[PDB]
Structures are given as C-alpha cells and as structure tokens.
Design a protein around this motif. Structure first.
Motif, PDB file in Angstrom:
ATOM      1  N   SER A 256      31.193 -32.738 -20.475  1.00  0.00           N
ATOM      2  CA  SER A 256      32.487 -32.638 -19.657  1.00  0.00           C
ATOM      3  C   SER A 256      32.899 -33.741 -18.763  1.00  0.00           C
ATOM      4  CB  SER A 256      32.772 -31.367 -19.221  1.00  0.00           C
ATOM      5  OG  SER A 256      32.775 -30.436 -20.183  1.00  0.00           O
ATOM      6  N   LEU A 257      33.744 -34.593 -19.007  1.00  0.00           N
ATOM      7  CA  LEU A 257      34.085 -35.706 -18.218  1.00  0.00           C
ATOM      8  C   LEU A 257      35.737 -35.581 -17.819  1.00  0.00           C
ATOM      9  CD1 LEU A 257      34.294 -39.018 -20.250  1.00  0.00           C
ATOM     10  CD2 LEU A 257      34.491 -36.847 -21.144  1.00  0.00           C
ATOM     11  N   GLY A 258      36.086 -36.690 -16.843  1.00  0.00           N
ATOM     12  CA  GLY A 258      37.553 -36.710 -16.589  1.00  0.00           C
ATOM     13  C   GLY A 258      37.564 -38.079 -15.810  1.00  0.00           C
ATOM     14  N   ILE A 259      38.920 -38.212 -15.575  1.00  0.00           N
ATOM     15  CA  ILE A 259      39.191 -39.580 -14.792  1.00  0.00           C
ATOM     16  C   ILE A 259      38.613 -39.489 -13.370  1.00  0.00           C
ATOM     17  CG2 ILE A 259      40.963 -41.067 -14.092  1.00  0.00           C
ATOM     18  CD1 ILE A 259      42.590 -39.755 -16.635  1.00  0.00           C
ATOM     19  N   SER A 260      38.062 -40.712 -12.872  1.00  0.00           N
ATOM     20  CA  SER A 260      37.463 -40.709 -11.671  1.00  0.00           C
ATOM     21  C   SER A 260      37.642 -41.841 -10.782  1.00  0.00           C
ATOM     22  CB  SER A 260      36.002 -40.336 -11.717  1.00  0.00           C
ATOM     23  OG  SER A 260      35.491 -41.468 -12.418  1.00  0.00           O
ATOM     24  N   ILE A 261      37.970 -41.869  -9.546  1.00  0.00           N
ATOM     25  CA  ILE A 261      38.209 -43.108  -8.963  1.00  0.00           C
ATOM     26  C   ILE A 261      36.777 -43.578  -8.550  1.00  0.00           C
ATOM     27  CG2 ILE A 261      39.341 -43.753  -6.763  1.00  0.00           C
ATOM     28  CD1 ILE A 261      39.964 -40.236  -7.714  1.00  0.00           C
ATOM     29  N   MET A 262      36.707 -45.062  -8.753  1.00  0.00           N
ATOM     30  CA  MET A 262      35.622 -45.806  -8.397  1.00  0.00           C
ATOM     31  C   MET A 262      35.981 -46.968  -7.277  1.00  0.00           C
ATOM     32  SD  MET A 262      32.916 -47.975 -10.449  1.00  0.00           S
ATOM     33  CE  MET A 262      33.876 -48.660 -11.723  1.00  0.00           C
ATOM     34  N   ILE A 263      35.174 -46.935  -6.077  1.00  0.00           N
ATOM     35  CA  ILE A 263      35.327 -47.460  -5.103  1.00  0.00           C
ATOM     36  C   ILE A 263      34.314 -48.418  -4.821  1.00  0.00           C
ATOM     37  CG2 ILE A 263      37.291 -46.492  -4.354  1.00  0.00           C
ATOM     38  CD1 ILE A 263      35.271 -45.419  -2.128  1.00  0.00           C
ATOM     39  N   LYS A 264      34.111 -49.339  -3.902  1.00  0.00           N
ATOM     40  CA  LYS A 264      33.067 -49.935  -3.391  1.00  0.00           C
ATOM     41  C   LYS A 264      32.517 -49.098  -2.123  1.00  0.00           C
ATOM     42  CE  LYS A 264      31.280 -54.659  -1.907  1.00  0.00           C
ATOM     43  NZ  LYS A 264      31.691 -56.129  -1.594  1.00  0.00           N
ATOM     44  N   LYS A 265      30.931 -48.891  -2.242  1.00  0.00           N
ATOM     45  CA  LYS A 265      30.542 -48.397  -1.184  1.00  0.00           C
ATOM     46  C   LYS A 265      30.638 -48.735   0.201  1.00  0.00           C
ATOM     47  CE  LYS A 265      26.321 -46.687  -1.608  1.00  0.00           C
ATOM     48  NZ  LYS A 265      26.878 -45.264  -1.372  1.00  0.00           N
ATOM     49  N   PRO A 266      31.241 -48.152   1.186  1.00  0.00           N
ATOM     50  CA  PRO A 266      31.420 -48.450   2.675  1.00  0.00           C
ATOM     51  C   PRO A 266      30.172 -49.144   3.325  1.00  0.00           C
ATOM     52  CG  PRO A 266      32.521 -46.516   2.335  1.00  0.00           C
ATOM     53  CD  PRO A 266      31.705 -46.521   1.251  1.00  0.00           C
ATOM     54  N   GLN A 267      30.537 -50.259   3.817  1.00  0.00           N
ATOM     55  CA  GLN A 267      29.113 -51.041   4.654  1.00  0.00           C
ATOM     56  C   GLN A 267      29.504 -50.871   5.919  1.00  0.00           C
ATOM     57  N   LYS A 268      28.557 -51.410   6.647  1.00  0.00           N
ATOM     58  CA  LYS A 268      28.823 -51.304   8.216  1.00  0.00           C
ATOM     59  C   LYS A 268      29.948 -51.955   8.768  1.00  0.00           C
ATOM     60  N   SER A 269      30.734 -51.507   9.291  1.00  0.00           N
ATOM     61  CA  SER A 269      31.936 -52.007  10.150  1.00  0.00           C
ATOM     62  C   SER A 269      31.646 -53.247  10.995  1.00  0.00           C
ATOM     63  CB  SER A 269      33.005 -50.781  10.416  1.00  0.00           C
ATOM     64  OG  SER A 269      33.943 -51.567  11.379  1.00  0.00           O
ATOM     65  N   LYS A 270      32.284 -54.140  10.767  1.00  0.00           N
ATOM     66  CA  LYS A 270      32.106 -55.508  11.691  1.00  0.00           C
ATOM     67  C   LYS A 270      32.705 -55.073  13.201  1.00  0.00           C
TER      68      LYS A 270
END
Ligand SMILES: CCCCCCCCCCCCCCCC(=O)O
Ligand SMILES: CCCCCCCCCCCCCCCC(=O)O
Lengths: 49, 49
Positions: B9-23
C-alpha cells in the motif's frame, strides 16, 4: 467469501496519552535551586549582614 | 484483467531535501532569548531608569 478491494488501508499503530504543553509557571526562574536553598540563602543573607 | 489483493500500500508523498546545518546569521547572538524578551528588557531598562 470473496472480499472486494480494500476501501480503507490500516495497520497496527501505537497509542499513548497525549502529553501537555507544560505551560511554565510564573516563578519558574527559581527552579534551578530547591526551595530549601532559596530559604537558606535568605537566612545566610540576614546572618552575614 | 483481474488483479489480486494488494501486496503493498502506497500513496502520494512529499519529497524534500534533508535540512543541513543553518549558516549562522549576523545577529544570531540574540537567539537564546525570544524577540519579546529583548523588547521587554528595553522597556524594563527605561522603566527602572
Ligand atoms: C541576597 C540574598 C537573597 C537574594 C534574593 C533571592 C530571592 C529568592 C527568595 C525567595 C524564594 C523562596 C522560594 C520559594 C519558592 C520555591 O522555589 O518553591
Ligand atoms: C538594556 C539593553 C539590553 C540589550 C538589548 C539588545 C537588543 C535590542 C533590540 C531588541 C529587539 C530586537 C532584537 C531581537 C530580534 C529578533 O531576534 O527577532
């Protein structure tokens, strides 16, 4: 029997008691030290003076 | 055709970039306290004086 295609996918999950926002108390800046220390500081203050 | 019962069972899912250290920001030295606290400190400074 012959089921139809699932109309609701589900599974076994985990239920826990929803926590609280733990609204800080008004006089919570005293929390790093115990009431006894704060009371003894006042006594020490009076004695030293 | 005739499909069998679902094996996944699957569905629509949001893909993003993994947060990195904030400057670190220019005025990052103000992060430990909220903007409200700094504003109220200024008001307390004026009032006390
Ligand atoms: C100069 C010596 C005294 C300085 C002022 C310290 C202020 C703290 C005294 C009052 C706090 C008493 C603690 C009761 C509240 C609690 O922590 O449960
Ligand atoms: C008695 C003065 C103490 C020093 C005060 C320094 C900060 C002055 C300005 C306060 C408001 C803006 C700073 C917070 C900004 C933010 O983090 O959103």
């Amino acid at each position: 029997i012959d089921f139809s295609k699932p109309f609701m996918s589900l599974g076994i999950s985990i239920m826990i008691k929803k926590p609280q926002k733990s609204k800080p108390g008004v006089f919570s800046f005293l929390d790093p030290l115990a009431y006894e220390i704060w009371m003894c500081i006042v006594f020490a203050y009076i004695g030293v003076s």
